[PDB]
């Protein structure tokens, strides 16, 4: 997502050539030394074995010519806070003394209370009299990175789950609809107009031709310019990169305006996920231990759905025996499977390929090789000749179906500068509209990740008194012990922002909103709101707003002052005996989909030197039955299974084919033999001149 782009930049990495390795990493280099405040975010770091070695710059940080991370502060003089922003490095941060931005400035630069929170040189925190303060912070949320500043109600979340939230806010996938978050910070707009994935009107003008591919802007003084989109362009991780315009043919634009949304954007505000209705009951054990259930509405109406564009590539490299020709005809390939291939050998744009289809048909010279008597007989009887030239056509990998968005053919005849030996390199871009599925990983903005345990139908879903079904159902037990009640506040505010409130100020603005800005005394349904990070919605504000929502269509305040509602069980029918929390939470679709993870092997490729099965989903490979699992099955006493998994599934070269033959013929699985890692060893020891021999007696 665009944010992952803008955050892979601005990244500080201490594990580089000229730095330290992940083994020479002194454990004193990963802690947040108190000089990091305003120069490096203490929250956002990868949670793997890299914690603290990789971080990200602060929002306001700026790098000194010499390379020291400066930071803006406000100069307070004679107890007068000014607006002359002055930048300071860590040394002058230690010399001088720094106040806080959430301090009572009395509209004149003047502090109010003499005892002021302040930071001393060694990270100490002290109540200085308000005369020795010479610098004050430029704003709150100065300590924090870009991605973490987009988490509403961050100050309520624990640092662990906020860290997780920041590290998963960069893993959302671009959906096909891209809905803006109902509740957010100020950093959804400034994180898109500066991430580069949103076309920007360079100079003011009026649009003339707005089409799905090109916008023509008529810059006032004569000149015109055509901005061009990148519809359905493959990203570096297989995701879509569409750019659709948002302007009409008569609109006037100003310089610096958003003119076309990107992959994850809506009206210019970073939008990584959808605003889904959420209830917080534990339901039937399907949302057990972080699991999440969904309505079938999310699948059907295509609410959560990510387009994945995969690239396949085959080169027509030269060979000694001859030249590999990308041609339709292939030795044994029948016309039935051949149907897709057009003439050159490539598929036609649009053919729905499935695991095993011939995307590109390439035939490689093989020369004359002996034909087994039996094969010769069959070939003659059925009237099929040899055509020695062997088949090595590209085939769509297992579980990579979809349409063929586009085919790109590079050839030496066209003077394309392919690497030496490659007469032709063709790349086929297949693509699929993956929908939400059991095992897909969904997460909010607060670290509350979880797989989809079950997509229930729409009727067996707890619906409100209005008949509106809830869309997801999180679990309760995950909230209190993870210390991330942000999601709860985000939930309540979310509902407030959906139904819209009307501050009952008929008798004057209640104290609950005495400090709330103007034009918040009333709000409209589906009205967008924002809470900055460390100056957000004081809990009292949420209580009062939650108790001051306007009814939907009838006279019906569905969510009472406590924030809960009377849900009806969609399955049984009886109302739940206790009111339940409901609201609108903004949740994302992470890039840990099942289709990228499910894997299986019965018999596939084999390694070269040792004869073990290969490794990884790119090949088939098996799962490493490692040392600890060997201990586990030694502890059970399972000897025969251990012998199996270490002889006639991995290495017993003559034993594997016998096992397969005996399975097909329906016979007892053969007795296993010596592996091929106790014979390479034997020949090595008889090669280092150590006579290792086996004598039964």
């Amino acid at each position: 997502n665009p944010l992952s782009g803008l955050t892979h930049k601005r990244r500080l990495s201490a594990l580089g050539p000229g730095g330290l390795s992940r083994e020479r990493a002194g454990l004193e280099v990963r802690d947040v030394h108190p000089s990091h405040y305003g120069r490096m975010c203490p929250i956002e770091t990868p949670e793997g074995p890299n914690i603290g070695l990789i971080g990200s710059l602060s929002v306001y940080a700026r790098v000194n010519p010499f390379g020291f991370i400066e930071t803006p502060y406000r100069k307070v003089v004679d107890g007068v806070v000014s607006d002359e922003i002055v930048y300071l490095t860590a040394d002058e941060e230690d010399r001088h003394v720094v106040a806080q931005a959430n301090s009572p400035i009395d509209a004149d630069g003047r502090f109010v209370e003499p005892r002021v929170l302040v930071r001393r040189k060694a990270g100490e925190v002290e109540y200085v009299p308000s005369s020795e303060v010479d610098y004050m912070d430029v704003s709150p949320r100065q300590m924090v990175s870009v991605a973490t500043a987009m988490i509403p109600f961050l100050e309520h979340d624990d640092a662990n789950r906020a860290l997780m939230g920041a590290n998963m806010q960069r893993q959302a996938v671009p959906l096909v609809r891209s809905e803006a978050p109902l509740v957010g910070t100020g950093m959804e707009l400034r994180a898109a107009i500066d991430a580069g994935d949103v076309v920007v009107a360079e100079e003011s003008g009026v649009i003339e031709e707005v089409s799905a591919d090109y916008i023509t802007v008529m810059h006032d003084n004569g000149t015109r310019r055509t901005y061009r989109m990148r519809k359905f362009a493959r990203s570096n991780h297989g995701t879509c990169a569409n750019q659709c315009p948002i302007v009409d043919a008569g609109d006037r634009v100003e310089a610096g305006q958003v003119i076309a949304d990107g992959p994850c954007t809506d009206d210019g505000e970073m939008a990584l996920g959808k605003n889904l209705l959420v209830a917080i009951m534990p339901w039937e054990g399907h949302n057990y231990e972080d699991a999440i259930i969904l309505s079938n509405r999310l699948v059907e109406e295509d609410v959560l759905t990510s387009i994945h564009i995969e690239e396949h590539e085959i080169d027509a490299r030269d060979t000694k025996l001859g030249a590999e020709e990308i041609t339709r005809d292939i030795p044994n390939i029948s016309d039935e499977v051949l149907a897709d291939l057009d003439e050159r050998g490539i598929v036609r744009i649009g053919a729905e390929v499935r695991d095993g289809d011939i995307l590109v048909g390439k035939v490689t010279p093989k020369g004359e090789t002996e034909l087994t008597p039996e094969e010769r007989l069959l070939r003659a009887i059925f009237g099929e000749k040899a055509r020695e030239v062997r088949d090595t056509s590209l085939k769509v990998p297992h579980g990579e179906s979809g349409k063929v968005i586009g085919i790109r053919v590079f050839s030496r005849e066209d003077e394309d500068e392919l690497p030496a030996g490659v007469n032709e390199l063709v790349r086929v871009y297949v693509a699929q509209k993956r929908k939400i599925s059991d095992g897909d990983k969904l997460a909010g903005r607060h670290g509350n990740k979880g797989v989809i345990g079950k997509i229930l139908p729409v009727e067996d879903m707890p619906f409100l008194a209005d008949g509106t079904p809830v869309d997801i159902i999180l679990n309760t037990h995950g909230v209190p012990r993870r210390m991330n009640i942000g999601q709860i506040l985000e939930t309540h505010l979310g509902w407030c922002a959906h139904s819209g409130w009307k501050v009952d100020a008929a008798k004057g603005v209640p104290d609950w909103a005495a400090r709330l800005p103007d034009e918040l005394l009333e709000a409209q349904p589906n009205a967008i709101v924002s809470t900055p990070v460390f100056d957000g919605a004081q809990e009292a504000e949420l209580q009062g707003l939650l108790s001051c929502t306007l009814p939907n269509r009838d006279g019906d305040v569905l969510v009472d002052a406590d924030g809960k509602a009377m849900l009806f069980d969609g399955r049984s029918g009886e109302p739940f005996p206790y009111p339940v929390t409901v609201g609108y939470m903004y949740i994302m679709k992470l890039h840990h989909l099942v289709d990228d993870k499910i894997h299986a092997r019965s018999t596939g490729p084999y390694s070269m030197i040792t004869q073990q099965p290969l490794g990884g989903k790119a090949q088939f490979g098996g799962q490493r039955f490692g040392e600890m699992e060997c201990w586990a099955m030694q502890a059970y006493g399972a000897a025969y299974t251990l012998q199996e998994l270490l002889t006639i599934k991995s290495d017993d070269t003559v034993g594997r084919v016998k096992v397969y033959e005996a399975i097909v013929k329906g016979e007892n699985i053969p007795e296993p033999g010596i592996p091929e890692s106790f014979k390479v060893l034997l020949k090595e020891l008889q090669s280092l001149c150590l006579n290792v021999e086996v004598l039964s007696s």
Binding site: N102, V138, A180, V253
Partner: peptide
């Protein structure tokens, strides 16, 4: 705010941040 076509997103900021995001 300060971006021509800005989604009118009402903020709860009690404070007033002087410096713009760089």
């Amino acid at each position: 705010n300060s971006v021509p076509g800005a989604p009118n997103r009402v903020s709860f900021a009690k404070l007033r941040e002087p410096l713009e995001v760089p």
